[PDB]
Design a protein around this ligand. Structure first.
Ligand code: NAG
Ligand code: NAG
Ligand code: NAG
Lengths: 49, 97, 145, 49
């Protein structure tokens, strides 16, 4: 999921855009992927309980 | 075929070749002419083999020595005013040998 | 004028019109890559004002210089002052002419150029807003602890 | 000595340790001067008496 950025591949965004502009897109990717991981961890917690 | 030509047109009638559907390797350009003026404005002579472009125009004309320095964006002269004027916003390179 | 700076660095130079747009944290172009490079995490101010009354004269003036030919990139806030002819092909050639180019060309300026070609006097200021004993301030105020 | 972003840093601690060679007991290092050189360093050399 592109999460609202240009592309979904980190090595693509890094190799295609400069650091200080690709920073916004990689921040968006961090905020999306980490939220997904958080949701997964919470569901795992409920199932484990 | 643009640099192995034998009848490079004059400046008053500058031949314009539309280059399309090809891979732009610049080593064939580097080995074909012992350049004397390879100045660029929008890109770098070295930084060109790793870039993609939509379309390429190769304007070829034989001209005098000082007119080589005359040919540049934002210039003046009998060539830069009446024969061939380079736009100030030019993204390309010139080659003189 | 309401802060404290440990050390202030004032660089100075003369450049053309579009180069003012070029000069910025981490930009591209021969001026930003072979002539002057700012750090990505730059904390400071850039100052540019058109100056065609001192950097121009009749019959032109070619005293200024700028580098287009350098083997590698500039690291932030480095010099590199040198006159070494760029290597082309594989020749160890040392001189001017074919495949042996002078590293820097003239930045000649005239009273009659376009706006993008007009001498744009650019000075930059570097600041260090870190935790350290500062030196420079503005209006100073003091109350009893 | 270090030269990150210029700002030459000199750390030191003077003490008549056991004196055989480099000790084994832990010792800290107190910075003495921190001065912004802002130049290019590649090679290092020491002077004598
Ligand atoms: C034309 O092509 C031939 C064959 O590769 C080459 O030997 C010659 O140097 C070329 N001449 C020019 C002017 O490009
Ligand atoms: C431009 O080059 C082509 C190559 O085939 C030639 O036929 C044409 O006459 C040239 N034009 C001029 C102005 O010389
Ligand atoms: C420091 O000097 C060395 C030797 O001249 C050079 O290779 C290196 O690029 C320099 N580093 C700079 C100027 O950032």
């Amino acid at each position: 999921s592109k999460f609202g950025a240009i592309s979904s591949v980190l090595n693509d965004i890094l190799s295609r855009l400069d650091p200080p502009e690709a920073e916004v897109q990689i921040d968006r990717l961090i905020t999306g992927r980490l939220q997904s991981l958080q949701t997964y961890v919470t569901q795992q917690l409920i199932r484990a309980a | 075929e643009v640099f192995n030509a034998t009848r490079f047109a004059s400046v008053y009638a500058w031949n314009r070749t539309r280059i399309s559907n090809c891979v732009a390797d610049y080593s064939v350009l580097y080995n074909f002419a012992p350049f004397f003026a390879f100045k660029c404005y929008g890109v770098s002579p070295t930084k060109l083999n790793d870039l993609c472009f939509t379309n390429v125009y190769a304007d070829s004309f034989v001209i005098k020595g000082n007119e080589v320095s005359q040919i540049a964006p934002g210039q003046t002269g009998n060539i830069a005013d009446y024969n061939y004027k380079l736009p100030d916003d030019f993204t390309g390179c010139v080659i003189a040998w | 004028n309401d802060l404290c700076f440990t050390n202030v660095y004032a660089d100075s130079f003369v450049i053309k019109g579009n180069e003012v747009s070029q000069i910025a944290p981490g930009q591209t172009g021969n001026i930003a890559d072979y002539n002057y490079k700012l750090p990505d995490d730059f904390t400071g101010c850039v100052i540019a004002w058109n100056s065609n009354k001192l950097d121009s004269k009749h019959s032109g003036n070619y005293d200024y210089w700028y580098r287009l030919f350098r083997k590698s990139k500039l690291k932030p806030f480095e010099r590199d002052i040198s006159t070494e002819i760029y290597q082309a092909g594989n020749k160890p050639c040392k001189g001017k002419g074919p495949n042996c180019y002078f590293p820097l060309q003239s930045y000649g300026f005239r009273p009659t150029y376009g706006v993008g070609h007009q001498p744009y006097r650019v000075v930059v200021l570097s600041f260090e807003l870190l935790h350290a004993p500062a030196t420079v301030c503005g209006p100073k105020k003091s109350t009893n602890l | 000595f270090k030269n990150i972003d210029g700002y030459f840093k000199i750390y030191s601690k003077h003490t008549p340790i056991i004196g055989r060679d480099f000790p084994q007991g832990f010792s800290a290092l107190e910075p003495l001067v921190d001065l912004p050189i802002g130049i290019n360093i590649t090679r290092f050399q020491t002077l004598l008496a």
